[PDB]
Design an enzyme around this catalytic site. Sequence first.
Site, short mmCIF file in Angstrom:
data_model
loop_
_atom_site.label_atom_id
_atom_site.label_comp_id
_atom_site.label_asym_id
_atom_site.label_seq_id
_atom_site.Cartn_x
_atom_site.Cartn_y
_atom_site.Cartn_z
N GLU A 176 74.19 -37.03 66.63
CA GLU A 176 73.04 -36.16 66.93
C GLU A 176 71.75 -36.71 66.36
OE1 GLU A 176 72.88 -32.22 69.02
OE2 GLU A 176 71.52 -33.80 68.35
N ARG A 222 72.93 -22.40 59.40
CA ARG A 222 72.55 -23.77 59.12
C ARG A 222 71.37 -24.18 59.98
NH1 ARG A 222 73.92 -27.92 63.13
NH2 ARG A 222 75.74 -27.34 64.40
N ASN A 264 69.69 -26.67 62.67
CA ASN A 264 70.18 -27.57 63.71
C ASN A 264 69.06 -28.51 64.13
OD1 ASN A 264 72.25 -28.65 65.29
ND2 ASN A 264 71.74 -27.36 67.03
N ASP A 277 79.21 -20.75 62.67
CA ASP A 277 80.26 -20.45 63.65
C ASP A 277 79.73 -19.99 65.01
OD1 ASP A 277 79.32 -17.98 62.61
OD2 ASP A 277 81.24 -17.00 62.97
N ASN A 280 68.13 -25.82 69.62
CA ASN A 280 68.32 -27.22 70.01
C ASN A 280 67.02 -27.92 70.40
OD1 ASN A 280 70.51 -28.91 69.75
ND2 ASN A 280 71.84 -27.51 70.93
N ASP A 285 71.14 -29.58 75.47
CA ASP A 285 71.30 -29.80 74.02
C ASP A 285 69.98 -30.41 73.53
OD1 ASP A 285 72.18 -30.48 71.40
OD2 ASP A 285 74.23 -30.82 72.10
#
Length: 307
Positions: A17, A107, A109, A127, A159, A211
Amino acid sequence: GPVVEKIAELGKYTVGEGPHWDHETQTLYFVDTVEKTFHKYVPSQKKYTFCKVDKLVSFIIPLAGSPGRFVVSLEREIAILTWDGVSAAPTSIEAIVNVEPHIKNNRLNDGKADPLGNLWTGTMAIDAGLPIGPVTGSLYHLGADKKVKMHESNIAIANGLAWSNDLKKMYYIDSGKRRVDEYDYDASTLSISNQRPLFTFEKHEVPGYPDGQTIDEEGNLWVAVFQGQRIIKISTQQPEVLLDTVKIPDPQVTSVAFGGPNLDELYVTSAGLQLDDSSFDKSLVNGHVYRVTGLGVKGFAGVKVKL
Ligand SMILES: [Mg+2]
């Protein structure tokens, strides 16, 4: 006919990523979120190195004016990583700010600097799930005063990000929404407003989830399609226009960055992590890094964070 090349030198990533091309040093940086590692690839010299930490990571961006220092995410902390680019452990880590101190299961990203060098990044549930899961994320930027400001909420999977060349628009992806949104962006106040859909996957028979993304010199967006085995090129001049599709062998394409000496090579990360309810058998899901050439467009070098 673009040519897609697997970069054999680099191996397989669980969730590769956050690709970032530093033009001054002709170096590609990226992360593996799940394996808690940062990676460096110097194509001209065929040099590959990595660094290990003990928190989940999601981006790595050089700090402006400080060679060997990087702005990175460590779970919910934005931190300065001092790394020599070759040793397997960092020299030091210094926290800047925890963006969500009291949301213990979130978290950071995707994250990127805007063209002015402000870090923009969003959060998500650790999750989080597709197509349905907890929706706990928000979109932030970090000022040079080290205070975060919130711009959007109710984000499932924070994203890809990009900005128009005239600094009037910002493009954003919440993967859970299966669309690319556009906003009016005010560079003076750093405010975004007037959210509207730019491109909706279901209207164009595009499988999977958007994404990461980046923008080229013509103003078109290049969007990685996770569980779509492709990158798509879409217009920003007009809504809902699919301009091109480029198939990538790995099904779980995650992100994209222009690079190479002439900024006309597209580097593409993917994920080998096999999830529940995949549309692809496991033998196909590998997590290689790819280079795409012959697209006939150039992009821009990665912007450093000013902080
Ligand atoms: Mg991503």
